């Protein structure tokens, strides 16, 4: 947990229906976006951070939380975006001899700012006399090892935690959901979806001259009017379907 990995996800399609067999007994409780519609969305930059923590400490992986893990091992920003995943891993990360390979920082001068890694192993001086490399009284090694005890409840069992950080912008998309790319139909009342932008209207060929960097098109009321499809790099107009009053 103290030396958590960091992985970059880009230029790929991310599917979430696959994350059932790989991570049984998962818990996708998360922040910043409704998980129900992660399928039809696009994410500009995705960061995956993985580590192993105890069962009772899984609640510490959340914005605004305080604790041993949140202060000294992994601090999340208050305005956090993205979803976290945690599932029990007793079958994989428990040894009869004793799992002494997972280390967590216990002593630290000051709390971590969000998204920081501390790999330092300098001896902690908890008293007045300098330690000078001695690990006696009031001189403690900052890193302690998890002593998992599966005989107790799930609060003493290793939980593997994977934390995903999104950005949620809809234009320079490089990571999008697993949905397909249906062929476009013109001059028909359809409800479209362009890089996570969902709207209903009729799509017509346009003569509006977008600059090479421009993507969208706004009307007076700041609602999208002309849009550029991700494929074929074409320019289109969005016109609401026919409507009116009945007398």
């Amino acid at each position, epitope marked *: 947990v103290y030396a*958590w990995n*960091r992985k970059r996800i880009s230029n790929c399609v991310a599917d979430y229906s696959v994350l059932y067999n790989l991570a049984p007994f998962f818990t996708f409780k998360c922040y910043g976006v409704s998980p129900t519609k992660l399928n039809d969305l696009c994410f500009t930059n995705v960061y995956a951070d993985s580590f192993v923590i105890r069962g009772d400490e899984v609640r510490q992986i959340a914005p605004g939380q305080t604790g041993n893990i949140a202060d000294y091992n992994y601090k999340l920003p208050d305005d956090f975006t993205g979803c976290v995943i945690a599932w029990n891993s007793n079958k994989l990360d428990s040894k*009869v001899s004793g799992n*002494y*390979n997972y280390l967590y920082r216990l002593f630290r001068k000051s709390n971590l700012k969000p998204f920081e890694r501390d790999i330092s192993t300098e001896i902690y001086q908890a008293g007045n006399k300098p330690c000078n490399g001695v690990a006696g009284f009031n001189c403690y090694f900052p890193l302690r090892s998890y002593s998992f005890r599966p005989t107790y409840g799930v609060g003493h069992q290793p939980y593997r935690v994977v934390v995903l950080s999104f950005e949620l912008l809809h234009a320079p998309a490089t990571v999008c959901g697993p949905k397909k790319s249906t062929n476009l139909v013109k001059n028909k009342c359809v409800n479209f979806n362009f890089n996570g932008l969902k709207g209903t209207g009729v799509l017509t060929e346009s003569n509006k001259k977008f600059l090479p960097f421009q993507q969208f098109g706004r009307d007076i009321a700041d609602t999208t009017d002309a849009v550029r499809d991700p494929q074929t790099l074409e320019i289109l107009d969005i016109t609401p379907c026919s409507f009116g009053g009945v007398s």
Partner: antibody
Framework: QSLEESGGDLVKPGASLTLTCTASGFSFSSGYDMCWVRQAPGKGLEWIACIGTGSSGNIYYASWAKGRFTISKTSSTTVTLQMTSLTAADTATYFC???????????????WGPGTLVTVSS | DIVMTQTPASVSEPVGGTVTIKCQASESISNWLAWYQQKPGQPPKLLIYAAFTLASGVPSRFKGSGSGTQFTLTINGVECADAATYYCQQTYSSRDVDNVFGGGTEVVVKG
């Protein structure tokens, strides 16, 4: 407990040999990983292949020995590795090491055998 | 997938000095590492597992340090019996890896 090896002799090039790693004082439990390495006469250690002694062996091979080598367990106290087409550079000292965790791969090698000398010549 | 290098190739110091050895990885291995000591004509022995923990029966003179990508092994005092070869092992992912061990670094103690 000891993990002495056997089956080491002079072998002509382009031939086959079958080394045998035999445990002494214990049997192959399922919670440990029995695994193979070699050492060139003047180079460092290098890893060949690695087999799990559990119910379903998580058999693993190195990139430079993808199909040249093949590891297999034959009994409760014998694990055998055999290789075909020994080239001039395959001469080495083969150590049969035991692991300490069944994580489908070679973890820390807590236990080592005395090692056997296998050379190739004409 | 993960490859390591061991530096320096060789070191030498008086009996009263301290030697340091660097083992770096291509990608982050976090904690999983091991330091093996091999005497000539003898199978190697485990010294440091989990990159910090001393082995069993090893004197408290070998210190492991660092985590993630850079690892350093420090010997606070040599006694002419530590002149041997030392290797570092990834023990993190060996699915498709040419060699888990690192290169050779032999220590020469000029008594």
């Amino acid at each position: 407990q000891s993990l002495e090896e056997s089956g080491g002799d002079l072998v002509k090039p382009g031939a086959s040999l079958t080394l045998t790693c035999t445990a002494s004082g214990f049997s192959f439990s399922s919670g440990y990983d029995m695994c193979w390495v070699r050492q060139a006469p003047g180079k460092g250690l290098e890893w060949i292949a690695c087999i799990g002694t559990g119910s379903s062996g998580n058999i693993y091979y190195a990139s430079w020995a993808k199909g040249r080598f093949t590891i297999s367990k034959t009994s409760s106290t014998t694990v055998t590795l055999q290789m075909t087409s020994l080239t001039a550079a395959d001469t080495a000292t083969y150590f049969c090491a035991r692991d300490d965790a069944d994580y489908a791969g070679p973890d820390y090698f807590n236990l080592w055998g005395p090692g056997t000398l296998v050379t190739v010549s004409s | 997938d993960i490859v390591m290098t061991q530096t320096p190739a060789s070191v030498s110091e008086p009996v009263g000095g301290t030697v340091t050895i660097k083992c770096q990885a291509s990608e982050s291995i976090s904690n999983w590492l091991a330091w093996y000591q091999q005497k000539p004509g003898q199978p190697p022995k485990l010294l440091i597992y989990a990159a910090f923990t001393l082995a069993s029966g090893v004197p408290s003179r070998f210190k492991g340090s660092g985590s993630g990508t850079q690892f350093t092994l420090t010997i606070n005092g040599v006694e002419c019996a530590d002149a041997a070869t030392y290797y570092c092992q990834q023990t993190y992912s060996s699915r498709d890896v040419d060699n888990v061990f690192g290169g050779g670094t032999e220590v020469v103690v000029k008594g």
